[PDB]
Amino acid sequence: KRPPGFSPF
């Protein structure tokens, strides 16, 4: 999954 605190692409 996408790690929290990083830019969503």
Curated annotation (Swiss-Prot):
Residues the record marks as site: Cleavage: P8, F9
Modification sites for 4-hydroxyproline: P4
Superkingdom per UniProt: Eukaryota
Protein's name in the database: Lysyl-bradykinin
Residues of the full protein shown: 380 to 388 of 644
